């Protein structure tokens, strides 16, 4: 049997958020000039001549 009052509920939610799918588009990235490019040892690579 249908009880209108007992059937009533209040549903909560957040108000007005915005969902961003991609996550690296906001990142801009650049490389040092590869002549002065360095490895783990803090010592240049492609230096022998």
């Amino acid at each position: 049997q249908f009880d209108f009052r007992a059937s009533m509920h209040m549903l909560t939610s957040n108000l007005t958020f915005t969902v961003y799918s991609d996550l690296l588009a906001f990142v801009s990235a650049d490389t040092v000039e590869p002549i002065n490019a360095v490895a783990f040892d803090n010592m240049r690579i492609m230096n022998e001549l």
Binding site: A25, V27, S28, A29, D30
Partner: protein, 72 residues
């Protein structure tokens, strides 16, 4: 008819290399104006007569709008 034409064409020992020079200088001069609105690194320029192309690399990934605005 004889018309005032104080400009360049073929039929000369000079036309080829000199046109390459002038087009190279022209693009080097223009390409330093997009820099007023974009950051890019000119990787390569080439000029051969009836065409010329320059490649350029950005700090980020390319979009449609940057292509449009760069062209305009």
């Amino acid at each position: 008819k004889k018309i005032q034409y104080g400009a360049v064409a073929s039929g000369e020992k000079q036309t080829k290399a000199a046109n390459s020079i002038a087009n190279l200088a022209l693009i080097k001069t223009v390409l330093s104006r997009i820099s007023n609105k974009y950051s890019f690194a000119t990787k390569i320029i080439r000029v051969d007569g009836d065409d010329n192309y320059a490649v350029l690399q950005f700090n980020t990934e390319v979009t449609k709008q940057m292509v449009q605005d760069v062209s305009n």
